[PDB]
Symmetry: D2
Subunit: 498 residues, 4 copies
Amino acid sequence: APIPGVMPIGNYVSLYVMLPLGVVNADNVFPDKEKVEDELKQVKAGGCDGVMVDVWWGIIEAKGPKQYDWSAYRELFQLVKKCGLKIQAIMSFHQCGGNVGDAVFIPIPQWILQIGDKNPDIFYTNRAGNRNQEYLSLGVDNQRLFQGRTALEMYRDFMESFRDNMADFLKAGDIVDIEVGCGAAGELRYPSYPETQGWVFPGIGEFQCYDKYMVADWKEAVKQAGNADWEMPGKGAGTYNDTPDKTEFFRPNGTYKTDMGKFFLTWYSNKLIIHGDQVLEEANKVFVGLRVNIAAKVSGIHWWYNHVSHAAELTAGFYNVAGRDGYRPIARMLARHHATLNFTCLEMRDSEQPAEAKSAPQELVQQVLSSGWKEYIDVAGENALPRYDATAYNQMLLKLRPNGVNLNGPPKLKMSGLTYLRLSDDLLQTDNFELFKKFVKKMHADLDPSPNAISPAVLERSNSAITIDELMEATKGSRPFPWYDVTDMPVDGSNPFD
Amino acid sequence: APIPGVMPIGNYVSLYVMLPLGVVNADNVFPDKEKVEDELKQVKAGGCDGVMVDVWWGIIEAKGPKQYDWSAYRELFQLVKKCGLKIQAIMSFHQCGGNVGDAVFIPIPQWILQIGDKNPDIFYTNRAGNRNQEYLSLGVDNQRLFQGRTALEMYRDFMESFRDNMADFLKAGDIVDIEVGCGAAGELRYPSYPETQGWVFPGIGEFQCYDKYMVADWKEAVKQAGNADWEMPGKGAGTYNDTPDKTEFFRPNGTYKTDMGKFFLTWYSNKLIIHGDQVLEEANKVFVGLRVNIAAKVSGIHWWYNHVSHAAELTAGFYNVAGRDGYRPIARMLARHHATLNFTCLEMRDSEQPAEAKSAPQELVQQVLSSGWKEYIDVAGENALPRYDATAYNQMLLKLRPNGVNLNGPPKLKMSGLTYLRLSDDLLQTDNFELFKKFVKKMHADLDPSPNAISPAVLERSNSAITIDELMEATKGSRPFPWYDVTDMPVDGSNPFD
Amino acid sequence: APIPGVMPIGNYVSLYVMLPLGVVNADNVFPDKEKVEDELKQVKAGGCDGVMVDVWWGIIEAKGPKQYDWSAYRELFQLVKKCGLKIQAIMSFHQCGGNVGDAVFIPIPQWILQIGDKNPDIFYTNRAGNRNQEYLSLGVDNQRLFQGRTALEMYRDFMESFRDNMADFLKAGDIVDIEVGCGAAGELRYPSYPETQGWVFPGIGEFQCYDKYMVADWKEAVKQAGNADWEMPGKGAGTYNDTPDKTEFFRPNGTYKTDMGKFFLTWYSNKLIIHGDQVLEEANKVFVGLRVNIAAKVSGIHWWYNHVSHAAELTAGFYNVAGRDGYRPIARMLARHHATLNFTCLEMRDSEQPAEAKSAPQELVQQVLSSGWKEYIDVAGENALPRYDATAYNQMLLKLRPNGVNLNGPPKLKMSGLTYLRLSDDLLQTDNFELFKKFVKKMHADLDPSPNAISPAVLERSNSAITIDELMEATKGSRPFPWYDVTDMPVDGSNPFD
Amino acid sequence: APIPGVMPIGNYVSLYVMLPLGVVNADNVFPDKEKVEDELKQVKAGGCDGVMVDVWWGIIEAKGPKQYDWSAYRELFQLVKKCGLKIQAIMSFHQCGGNVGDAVFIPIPQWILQIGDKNPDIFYTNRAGNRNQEYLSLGVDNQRLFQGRTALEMYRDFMESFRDNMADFLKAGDIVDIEVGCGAAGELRYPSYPETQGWVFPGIGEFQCYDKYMVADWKEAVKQAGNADWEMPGKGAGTYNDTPDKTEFFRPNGTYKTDMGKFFLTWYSNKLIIHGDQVLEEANKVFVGLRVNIAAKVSGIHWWYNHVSHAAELTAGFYNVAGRDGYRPIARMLARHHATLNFTCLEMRDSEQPAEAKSAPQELVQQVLSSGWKEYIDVAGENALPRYDATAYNQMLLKLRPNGVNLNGPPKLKMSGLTYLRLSDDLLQTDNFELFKKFVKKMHADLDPSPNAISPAVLERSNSAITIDELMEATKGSRPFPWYDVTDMPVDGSNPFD
Ligand SMILES: OC[C@H]1O[C@H](O[C@H]2[C@H](O)C[C@H](O)O[C@@H]2CO)[C@H](O)[C@@H](O)[C@@H]1O
Ligand SMILES: OC[C@H]1O[C@H](O[C@H]2[C@H](O)C[C@H](O)O[C@@H]2CO)[C@H](O)[C@@H](O)[C@@H]1O
């Protein structure tokens, strides 16, 4: 029996804060140095472990191919290191929305946008023929279209330039995570719910496989199956803001239940898995032998989860239906590269969602985290929308330790880390910043911060294993681990006794 | 993330087997040495960790006060030690039923039965005036009636004679547990459901506080409360085989809900707690500084648990009702002496009980184990009735690890050990003995036996703390820890995934 | 291979400081509270782990038998606990010199001195017939002469009164060591070099076995050997300030080499061992089951060590000669009670001693510590004379870790602790107190203090085993472990590389 | 204090046996499969941990550049894996003597010998102009002379072909060490004592830097120092079998003490260090992220060690003189690649060497192992000549743990492993094989074999750091750690007590 009052370190969970969006201007400039280093000081005073910042592709390689400028980000990291915080870098091969709302506009290298200018098919395309310019379609990962280099080669060269230019921070251990962007918002998914094309929650979304490079692939595949006459979904699949039932593809016993539907969804989902597999290999080769975690982000698509079609998840590329786990195979893939899974949604509660949405964020989180730990990989996460209430802090606290704390040692289930939405004035406001420091404490299980990177203490990155299209075994349905009902360590409460 | 296939030792749970009832004759004789040492060899071949044997008081101190004969038990232990098994000794200050059914008859020292012969009040008495001769009423713990010695002093002298005569086995570490008998069948309870007086499941039972020594105590207490005119229950409490509702004491809003009823139940239950407290102190003083666990046994009284009166538990001395945990204070008491709680019922399932019984064995087990771990003590257990089916083996397996195994280290919840009903021919039968060896393996979490006493590896016994009638704080209701639905490691099944 | 800059905790060695001699007046008064709590604050500011204080027998039981007053010592400990320091209590059953030099005079309970007044034989006596009143001769351990109680019983009752009155400090873990006094200055030895009787370094000393109770014992023993006509040493043994060679008992091939000499020395040394054995048993029984170390102090008698007679050691009671280890059997005895050996001399260097003295403090320390670790017990120590130079700090540092630090884990050889001479103004003087804080740091192996009682972290006291006059096996000569030449972590130096 | 009889695992040291020289014929054939698998079975029955085998370059790439055949070695490893032994593979880029003595003849790829046929300068050359064909001179590491590939590129391609073809054995963890050959006999040294050119112990040897590629380098370097007129040693340096004093270069106050001599030796020794640095980088890049140790072998050149010139060491390339550690910088270099140092000589005793030789093998071993552990790297080793006596087994046992065993945890100093000379009939002979099994037991510190690769349990290979010609700091003289006098665990003896 444990000694009363003794809380083992294994229960500690790192907590990082995301820095303001344009902390480094679209122009490679780092302004307001003084101010920023005052917020960082407060953040550190709150017991935070570190921060997560976007290393924008459209800024570093702005001037031209292979010519990178790390000057600013260098000052930014030295500043952070000076305040005693660890660093989570996101390799952002995407655009940071430049919509009316003014929020800083950071596209991808402009010279790339000029190539797609005469070759739209480099972007993800819906069936109407709209082109999304925030990320490069996977249909061109292995295509030589960018001044000699292929999409994948551009990704490695970037991470490689980053590895060599940040070697000192990496040696010292200041950089703890390398979050590899695999699509829009840096997430391994299709751009199925583009706000720029008229999407509004809770539309089902749209399939994004109509660029020419992807189509050809679909044609070759449909022929080797003996059904050369099969086509991709059409008006039957509907549009961005449709409902599953107003559709013929997602209605109960609809087209997705068909041999042809299963063949399409299998193809579309595998295509996304393979895109992830290939990007993470380059990431593995670039960081092997270093003490740092590599992670891919998987978005949480909870709307329509309680509908037989799991429509929203399907358009995004996750083939998750009854009797078919569409997440587990991703996790086995990530397992291959000894990578961590970062799930970007876990503060939400089923009741905070309109009934009309068929949303089930909690049940989603359980399945995803369960299939991750079942394939022996570390799972990390963050919140989706900004929040400063105790309700949100408690939900996140539940998910970091589904079975509460373990007084006998490391818990049975535990997330390796959580990154908080974003640092801001509304947060640093005396009031909020108070509740916050409480949440950070509960995150550390009432322990004091430990700059020794306890737990997630970066382990040496191992060389990848070897794949096989044997992921299909991974889709076997399974019972998710049982979740506690409420948090063990609430921010404004006492020991519920479980 | 853990390494696949690596099962940490912390998940291991010791499994012992109870030896045949009269393995040592009522006459201090150890017959059939040859046969027995062949069963022990099989038992050890099954991976069992050890065995539990009754060190009968009525055999060792048979000839007369202070004159003990450990000869036979000495041969028995040397034999066991030779077969490489650990030893769980029960200090049996009780009688082993000498009913018609022939099963060996072992009373308590006959010279004691001759004293109670002219002084019946030494035995537990019901209101009709029946005397139970299997154990000495707690009303005489501190009474000088036995040739100079008091009940408690007789208990310590016994354990003390046992400590000195078994010092070598204790030094070597062969004796791992000292199970201290506190009543009938060696359990801290009142003899409320005596089969010798006509009791048949699921009778509510009867209060056992009518001996003269206890009565006086009740009179003194009722007067200092200002209600000198209060009495103990009468015909209103009913008889052994009554139902809660046919009673006026246990009916909804019955007498037990009254100020007088609460005052009686509080008194009756505290009296049992104090009897335990005093017997375990003597046990502490006798074994301090030695590497061995001391444990008290608490019986599982599941019938009528789902009735507002918790009748059966009340007559046995456990004041467990809505908004009042009658087990937690016992556990805090046991915590004081760094003692382990042995719960004698945990293979049963709610469905194996007649609906008419209002029985809830599973919900009982949860509450008892939960309140034990909440007071920071080790909880151990055993099955109540003999069983050889996979259904029973799986239930016990669930309770030893309510949240399954922990691949990251010691589980969150885990029992320190389990002792199996009893070694017998029907068990050692090729068939059964097979299922059994499977159960032992799952008990060890598919690991190989570890004679190093892993986990429960006997720690040094610490001197007791100091009580206060501050147990009353312990009766505050609480949420029990959440239990998994099915076992993690079933005997004839695969990984349910939780 | 270890990680550079990582110093494992196992290399940490606790450092305590002795408080001023009369910190509690001969009159049970604790004056200058304010001042003292200012020194304690400085001491704690120096990183010290705790302090060691004399719990004088002549103060606590001054008024009369069994009537103890812990009032003052209670204030003293609460003050110390308030400054965050651990406590090493010495059960001082001796007198604290009340010589001309004024230094506070604290005798043993005056009522005892009045008994010896008519019975001088209670004190250790030399052959001239001088009586030493600082401690009770072992010849009366088992003699009922003190108002009903025996010497040993008076010792246990004292430690028992101390255990019950200090239970809270003991529970909390503030009291870490119980140093049990076994003679003059609290050391298991004979008062062979009494400064009160004219002794001046480096006299050989005198045997102290002439009180009547001891003599009788010697007569009974000499008769069962068949030499009833043997006598104790006479003028042949010389006097306090003689040299080994001017003697006939200690000259090469002198009387100590004889069958009669060996028989006397064997008897005299065993008598001291048994006195220790019996006092430590009482100490064991009183503190079993508690988290605290019990230790006996053995004085370092280095003069005449390099002479074949080891004269000084012989008169003190240590039968240490060529081919006979007179310390190892003491250590095996101490092993029996799971006790620690505190050696009171280990800062000295062979060169700081006059050549005429035949002194070998370093070689002594090696033998004593080696035989201690060989019998599996913890060895602790302190300096003999007050010192504030780097030479002394480095010697002590060598002996705490004879083989320096271990970057792979706990060192091979390591002392469990060291108590510094005594807190004083000449030490707290800005200058000295500086060198001191350096020494404390090196003691902790350049780590920061750890109030968690790391290493010596008080383990539960185990019940004693059982002796036999089989100590004689322990006198077999043996090679001491090899010692490093210089310290690993000097106060004013760098890594000598070993 | 440790528990008696408990030997911590950290004291365990792996023991491997070298397989017979041509276990795989010069013709890629694996004959006598049956016999061999019977010896392996005995070897495993002796508790050995594994075996070390030469993966000859002249066999695998015999047919032609880039065309490797791993067929045989594949059968050999599967056989070994079947017998439950770990594998130490030597990347042998050298020749295995094909002298008169018949012992199997295995040269390097014959097509390479045909190139050097018209270009002798690819081989190491002495001043008379003799060419050694057992290894490629470092003067051609970065020269494109081998059908497009450079020496270094040929080495990586080989290790890379080995990594990919042995991936399964590597994944499983059967291959534990990758011993990278850096010269003759696979050792980082110059071929200074070639038996093929008339060398006989204890000749001083000859400098091996006269090939044209090396000379040019020496000319460029001597000019930038402003002494363009300096030359390499001549007749003044003598010949293979000369004595240090009959020379003018190695005589006291000879040419090696001169500014010109120091400049030559500095250049010659650095050249060897850099050759090692470059070969180990390729090895690092090829094995990063895998759980396997990479090691370089440094030969033990003990003759003339006790002479001021350290002649033999100087000709071999180790600039080790008074006030200059010529080994430490090698170790700091090896530290850069997280590599292990394998010292090939450590059973010898100073007394087994002719006085005329000025040999000091023991003092050599101390310095080399000490400088290795001081630069934070693991040191391993083997014996130089075959031996089956207890004298030899005890010496090796001393060096594996210079300070014996540590009952408190991992020793202060400990070798990571030892590979035994070679499996043979004279060893497997009932007699010898007996003493042997004793030695293996003492190697494991009287523990039973642990196939879990305890201790050296292959850790993940980390990416290399980055060099600088800042090795020069490493040549600062230092005190080696102190060595125990005799072994802790002798094969035919008892506890010397240190
Ligand atoms: O962006 C607003 C969108 O946020 C949430 O959905 C997130 C998802 O949980 C994870 C990933 O970061 O992207 C999705 C959207 O980009 C809300 O659930 C949703 O209602 C809201 O419209
Ligand atoms: O008391 C002065 C005495 O101290 C040292 O001898 C100590 C011994 O090392 C340990 C024990 O504390 O008692 C002995 C004396 O009581 C000096 O070595 C000695 O020279 C000095 O006279």
